[PDB]
Amino acid sequence: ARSIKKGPFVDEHLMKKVEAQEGSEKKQVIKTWSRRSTIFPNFIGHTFAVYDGRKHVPVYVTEDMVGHKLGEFAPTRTFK
């Protein structure tokens, strides 16, 4: 949430899915329709298959990507 008082927004299903994956080193792809969810520090190293409206596109979190939404890294429109 843009207001600081409210925390960064993450869908519970996304966060819970990542939190379960914490234990094992060999992480697996997380399919999500949550373009709106924030990328937390915990997300680092994970590959999220974010829906583009037609297909889930592989998105691999890096340190810089934290603080940006998952939607930001998967395009919805195609030009040239």
Binding site: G7, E63, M65, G67
Partner: protein, 80 residues
């Protein structure tokens, strides 16, 4: 040196106002202000805003702290 072909060149005191550093070197600059030196002579004074002593790169002083990492800023901003 050929006579009359070169610009007038005289010893002048270069002073770093910031750090009060005085050094004597030749220049064609003429200063109305004149200052005494360790040797029994008075030379025109050139005032420098910055010098080797004052300049940050030379000193190695860090005026501004390095930019925080994306993980760091996220945690600090929301207090998490």
């Amino acid at each position: 040196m050929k006579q009359g072909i070169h610009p007038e060149y005289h010893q002048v005191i270069f002073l770093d106002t910031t750090t009060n550093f005085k050094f004597l070197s030749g220049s064609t600059k003429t200063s109305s202000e004149m200052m005494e030196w360790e040797d029994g002579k008075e030379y025109p004074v050139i005032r420098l805003d910055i010098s080797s002593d004052s300049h940050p790169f030379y000193t190695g002083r860090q005026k501004f702290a390095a930019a925080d990492g994306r993980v760091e800023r996220f945690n600090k901003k929301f207090g998490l």
